[PDB]
Amino acid sequence: SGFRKMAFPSGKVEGCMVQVTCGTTTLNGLWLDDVVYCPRHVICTSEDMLNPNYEDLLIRKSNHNFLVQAGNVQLRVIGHSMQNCVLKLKVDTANPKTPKYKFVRIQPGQTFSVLACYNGSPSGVYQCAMRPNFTIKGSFLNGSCGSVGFNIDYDCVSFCYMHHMELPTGVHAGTDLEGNFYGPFVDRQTAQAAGTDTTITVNVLAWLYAAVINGDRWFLNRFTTTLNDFNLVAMKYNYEPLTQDHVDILGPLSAQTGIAVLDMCASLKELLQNGMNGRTILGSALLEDEFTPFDVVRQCSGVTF
Amino acid sequence: SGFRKMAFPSGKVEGCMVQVTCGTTTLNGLWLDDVVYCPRHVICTSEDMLNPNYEDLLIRKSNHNFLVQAGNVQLRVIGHSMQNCVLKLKVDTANPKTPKYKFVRIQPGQTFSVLACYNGSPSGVYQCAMRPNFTIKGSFLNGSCGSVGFNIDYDCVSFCYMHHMELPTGVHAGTDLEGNFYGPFVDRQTAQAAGTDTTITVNVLAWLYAAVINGDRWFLNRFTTTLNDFNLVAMKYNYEPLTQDHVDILGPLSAQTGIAVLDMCASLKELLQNGMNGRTILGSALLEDEFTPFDVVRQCSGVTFQ
Numbered sequence: 001s002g003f004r005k006m007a008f009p010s011g012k013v014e015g016c017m018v019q020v021t022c023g024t025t026t027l028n029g030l031w032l033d034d035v036v037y038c039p040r041h042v043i044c045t046s047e048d049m050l051n052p053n054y055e056d057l058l059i060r061k062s063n064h065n066f067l068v069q070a071g072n073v074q075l076r077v078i079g080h081s082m083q084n085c086v087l088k089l090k091v092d093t094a095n096p097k098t099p100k101y102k103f104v105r106i107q108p109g110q111t112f113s114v115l116a117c118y119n120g121s122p123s124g125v126y127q128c129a130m131r132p133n134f135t136i137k138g139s140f141l142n143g144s145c146g147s148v149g150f151n152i153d154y155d156c157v158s159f160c161y162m163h164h165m166e167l168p169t170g171v172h173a174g175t176d177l178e179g180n181f182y183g184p185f186v187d188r189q190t191a192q193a194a195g196t197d198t199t200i201t202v203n204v205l206a207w208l209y210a211a212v213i214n215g216d217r218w219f220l221n222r223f224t225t226t227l228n229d230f231n232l233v234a235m236k237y238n239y240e241p242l243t244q245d246h247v248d249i250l251g252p253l254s255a256q257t258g259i260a261v262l263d264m265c266a267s268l269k270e271l272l273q274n275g276m277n278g279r280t281i282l283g284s285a286l287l288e289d290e291f292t293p294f295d296v297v298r299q300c301s302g303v304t305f
Numbered sequence: 306s307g308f309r310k311m312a313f314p315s316g317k318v319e320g321c322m323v324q325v326t327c328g329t330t331t332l333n334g335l336w337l338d339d340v341v342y343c344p345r346h347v348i349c350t351s352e353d354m355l356n357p358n359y360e361d362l363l364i365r366k367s368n369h370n371f372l373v374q375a376g377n378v379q380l381r382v383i384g385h386s387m388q389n390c391v392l393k394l395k396v397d398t399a400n401p402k403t404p405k406y407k408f409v410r411i412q413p414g415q416t417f418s419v420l421a422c423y424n425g426s427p428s429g430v431y432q433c434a435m436r437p438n439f440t441i442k443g444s445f446l447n448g449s450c451g452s453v454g455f456n457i458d459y460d461c462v463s464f465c466y467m468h469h470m471e472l473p474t475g476v477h478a479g480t481d482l483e484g485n486f487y488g489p490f491v492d493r494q495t496a497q498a499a500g501t502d503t504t505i506t507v508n509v510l511a512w513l514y515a516a517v518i519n520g521d522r523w524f525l526n527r528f529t530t531t532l533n534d535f536n537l538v539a540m541k542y543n544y545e546p547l548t549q550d551h552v553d554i555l556g557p558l559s560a561q562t563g564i565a566v567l568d569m570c571a572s573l574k575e576l577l578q579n580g581m582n583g584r585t586i587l588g589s590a591l592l593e594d595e596f597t598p599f600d601v602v603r604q605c606s607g608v609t610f611q
């Protein structure tokens with residue numbers, strides 16, 4: 001038993017991290033097959049970054065301007081191009097450690113593991129959710145750009161995030177691996193701000209189920225509610241709407257625990273209205289919203305990779 | 306910016322995980338060089354588990370009674386020995402993925418990464434602290450025995466924990482890699498209970514420093530305290546004593562933030578008295594005690610957001 005914020009094993013991704021240098025800038029890249037992917041902002045001086053013309057800046061660069069190092073081994077760049085906000089450096093060597101992989105774009109509320117890297121070297125791993133406002137609450141310092149986020153299923157690494165920048169409020173923004181930003185952000189040093197965030201309701205419900213599975217049940221009650229009535233409450237408390245698809249996805253946990261989703265919604269309604277009255281749930285005094293239903297089932301059933 | 310419970314990248318340890326089977330029991334082992342380490346309770350049946358005589362159980366085993374599988378490959382056992390509560394199986398193949406490594410026995414309050422594994426296959430990685438009562442609060446199911454805990458400061462893997470059992474209170478117990486239990490526990494299914502746990506005071510202080518580094522000061526106050534008065538108060542909230550060693554270890558964080566250690570102690574005293582009044586610290590509504598001073602320096606900026 002026990003329930004912890006758990007990342008995927010990172011080994012398959014560690015073997016893909018490289019160091020990319022352009023002029024005075026060093027950041028991280030992802031080496032898959034014979035391509036290294038990194039943020040296109042690698043090509044910008046501090047002055048360029050204020051208002052970059054990436055097409056014009058890139059035309060002035062040749063292959064030789066990009067130095068790529070995998071551990072102690074130099075990879076020779078033999079081509080370069082941009083896709084959206086990602087730079088693709090074709091290299092002369094296919095990564096022998098390339099895992100089975102896909103590029104996937106995730107939706108708000110979904111979780112993933114971040115492998116924080118500096119100078120091409122992995123430094124730490126932790127779980128994040130894509131917030132409703134399309135930021136992530138990561139932990140990133142100067143030099144972390146090009147760090148990636150991923151999920152695993154069986155043997156296949158699904159890459160979903162590449163880190164581009166920190167916003168003024170200390171949260172993080174980036175792209176999918178095809179270089180499309182999550183959220184209304186651009187790769188320019190200009191005033192940008194995350195929208196007001198909301199709480200991921202379906203994930204809070206999942207975590208309440210995790211709590212029940214782990215023997216923490218004080219918040220259960222005799223009441224139920226309707227989807228409509230619950231959603232009036234969610235809106236009042238800055239929670240995302242709960243949809244029928246969310247209810248369907250939670251169906252397993254309902255069956256296992258004997259608490260229908262709308263039953264658990266009545267618990268959540270009461271917690272929102274009344275607080276915890278000095279108690280905790282799974283050791284938390286806040287309602288946790290960065291576990292998906294799948295995360296709960298995975299962890300509670302010991303799925304391996 | 307940001308502050309998360311951050312594990313070490315697990316790849317160096319993943320390449321060492323194997324499955325060990327003895328009779329009907331399968332659990333995890335750690336394959337380093339030509340040795341596989343696992344809990345000695347692998348040799349016990351359910352009948353054996355109350356009062357196992359491990360010497361008597363082991364003498365009855367041959368090398369070929371142990372099956373070791375690394376992925377799809379069977380490793381041949383060519384010797385075995387018991388060291389304290391760990392079994393060491395000598396195998397005919399050195400692990401080609403053996404990282405630079407060492408074995409370290411840690412003290413209460415120290416943190417490490419756990420790679421939870423089942424059937425020799427990794428499931429996930431997360432951070433744990435050795436609690437003052439020598440348990441850990443992990444996430445471990447049936448089949449997770451032999452999962453390990455480790456740090457990877459400076460490219461070398463320091464193995465510090467091997468998982469042996471869950472206690473009745475739902476917390477976890479295990480050994481160092483020399484097979485010595487943390488705490489008073491034994492590898493027998495007899496009544497044992499952990500001591501009442503306490504809060505790791507030095508770690509709470511470290512995390513308050515992390516909050517200041519990351520730009521938040523709301524919880525500071527104009528007061529100070531002596532060390533002895535701090536301890537008299539904090540013990541009333543089930544906090545561990547703060548020692549001069551702890552004060553010394555907090556020196557770098559104190560220097561980076563300009564907040565004297567005993568002044569941060571005065572802040573903590575007031576937080577214990579007052580609660581948060583609806584605020585959070587680094588996204589938490591409780592006082593976090595599973596980040597060490599070293600963990601904070603590892604993760605945070607060296608420049609305070611003033």
Ligand SMILES: CCNC(=O)[C@H]1CCN(C(=O)c2cncc3sccc23)CCN1Cc1ccc(Br)cc1CC
Binds near residue numbers: 046143164
């Ligand atoms: C030389 C030109 N490159 C830059 O300026 C790089 C510098 C490196 N950065 C990091 O390594 C870092 C990452 N993650 C967290 C932190 S906290 C302090 C530093 C970081 C910050 C990102 N900026 C670009 C940038 C900055 C702001 C905005 Br808005 C947009 C953009 C464009 C996407």
Ligand SMILES: CCNC(=O)[C@H]1CCN(C(=O)c2cncc3sccc23)CCN1Cc1ccc(Br)cc1CC
Binds near residue numbers: 346354446473493
């Ligand atoms: C066949 C004889 N072996 C056993 O019985 C094994 C069975 C496997 N176990 C696990 O895989 C497991 C791990 N971590 C968490 C959980 S939650 C449910 C199960 C687990 C539990 C540990 N016990 C032994 C055991 C049990 C209790 C105590 Br006290 C001491 C001991 C001796 C050290």
Ligand SMILES: [Cl-]
Binds near residue numbers: 410415
């Ligand atoms: Cl230690």
Ligand code: NA
Binds near residue numbers: 223263
């Ligand atoms: Na109910």
